Design brief:
Two copies of one chain form a homodimer.
Chain A: H1 2-10, E1 15-18, E2 30-34, E3 39-44, H2 49-66, E4 74-79, E5 85-90, H3 101-117, E6 132-133, E7 136-137, H4 146-166, H5 169-181, E8 194-196, E9 205-207, E10 212-214, E11 220-222, H6 224-233, H7 239-248, H8 255-274, H9 279-290
Antiparallel strand pairs in A: 2-3, 3-5, 4-5, 6-7, 8-11, 9-10
Helix pairs in contact in A: 3-7, 4-5, 4-8, 5-9, 6-8, 8-9
PDB class: transferase
Keywords: kinase, apo-state, transferase
Assembly: dimeric
């Protein structure tokens, strides 16, 4: 227990956490108090910044429309002199997801069931506009078949970037072998398009006194299970999140092998964003899928 | 700049950045009340956390020894089971820098001038111990020549990490050309070592009712001008901070070109920490310098 360590090292009986969040993370954006409440502002001086933020607006609006999960309200996208854009959204007073984890597991399962169960059914995988995964714009072209969508517009896209930027022989050869085996992980299963947050890392979820909050989405209609891959692989969610979720959407047969395929996407995306530290998990995951 | 644009776009009379330390991009941070008063604790689980925090301790101590600026007292660096470290320091109630901006400009100029004006004899560039740029340990080996120190132990070090992790051909080729240009940016000036805070982002300065406060240093003896590059590039300092500062330390010839070189360092550091988003301004800044 880190609080027990601090009490011992500081020789104190009380250790009462208090106070506001501070200036935050330089690379993420900055919060401001205003006349109407706090806001959070992201700035991107690149020419495709408006397209990025409009994708995030589209994602936040799609999630808000379900009424099932709490996300910050988008307020404005501003074009900047010199290039790029700023995106302003509502800022919530927030803490790490802990007490609200089981509630968020329920809400995330309801979100994934919303499309199938509702009144205006989206019957393809993809999305009506471009959304970015981190800095990389994605193709969301509608496709009837999920393994086709995911192989072509998620895995192949990442691997083409790796080939362009690293010319990596082992990724190229392992992908030529893996590509053909992907349908074995989906046969005999019904896969229904599910609206996804798209980037449900523990650093994109939090909570307040009312309930859990999720943010920084990169949404599309996908296989529900894909949502959970990044959540599992980087940790940070209480067990009760997954317990609540899978009470509503039990793990289908083949869940753990599909989990590898979905974690592969995230490793490839991290290799393209952060470099070669992520080559070893990417290749290793491909190797695990092949044997 | 950005704040005036936000005020207009949001039609708000007030706009006050969230200020003070806390959870950043790199470490967690939380205040606690204890039997002996409040403290602020930073936590990092990476193996190099102790080294990082010992560098911050040394930097805080060097700044406090001058008696010219207010900074938190460092209290303890604690090894964590399971790896990493916690760093406890004095807690100060703070808001973002506003009314005290011109006072901080005076203080920062007096800080930089202290090695020249005070009972201080440091006639090389560098520092007596390792300090970290975020996660990245720095070499602070003493050097008589500032453009040598900055090229070798700041720019080259960042670009060697970019080569290792991204193997980026354009970065390598542009750097080789820029290395040849660097001495010309110094206008034959005699650079005097100045004690720097080293990371004077607006998120690392604040104020209380006594005056301004600075924190999260990464200190070394450098060219005074380097201090201002991150302050300018990410904004957040009122104009009166720079007015007050340059009344005491006027811009030397070539300031505007060196500002690009010093901002380059910060873009490379963001490329290394935060990924590919910062490739474009890194390469673009080098190209601008080569024009």
């Amino acid at each position: 227990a880190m609080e027990q360590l601090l009490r011992a090292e500081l020789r104190t009986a009380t250790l009462r956490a208090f106070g506001g969040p501070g200036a935050g993370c330089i690379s993420e954006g900055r919060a401001y108090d205003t006349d109407a409440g706090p806001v959070f502002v992201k700035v991107n001086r690149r020419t495709q910044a408006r397209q990025m933020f409009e994708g995030e607006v589209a994602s936040l609006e799609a999630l808000r429309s379900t009424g099932l999960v709490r996300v910050p309200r988008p307020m404005k996208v501003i074009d900047l002199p010199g290039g790029g854009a700023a995106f302003v959204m509502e800022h919530l007073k927030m803490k790490s997801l802990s007490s609200q984890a089981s509630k968020l597991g329920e809400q995330m399962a309801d979100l994934h069931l919303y499309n199938q169960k509702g009144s205006s059914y989206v019957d393809k995988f993809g999305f009506h506009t471009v959304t970015c995964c981190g800095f990389i714009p994605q193709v969301n072209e509608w496709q009837d078949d999920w393994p086709t969508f995911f192989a072509r517009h998620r895995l192949q896209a990442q691997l083409d970037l790796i080939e362009k930027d690293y010319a990596d022989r082992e990724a190229r050869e392992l992908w030529s072998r893996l590509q053909v085996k992907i349908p074995d992980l989906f046969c005999g299963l019904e896969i229904v398009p599910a609206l996804l947050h798209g980037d449900l890392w523990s650093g994109n979820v939090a909570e307040d006194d009312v309930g859990p909050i999720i943010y920084d989405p990169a949404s599309f209609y996908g296989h529900s299970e894909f949502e959970l891959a990044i959540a599992l692989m980087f940790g940070g969610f209480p067990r009760s999140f997954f317990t609540a979720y899978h009470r509503k959407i039990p793990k289908a047969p083949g869940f753990d092998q599909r989990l590898l395929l979905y974690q592969l996407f995230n490793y490839l995306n991290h290799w393209n964003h952060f470099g070669r530290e992520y080559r070893s998990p990417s290749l290793g995951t491909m190797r695990r899928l092949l044997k």
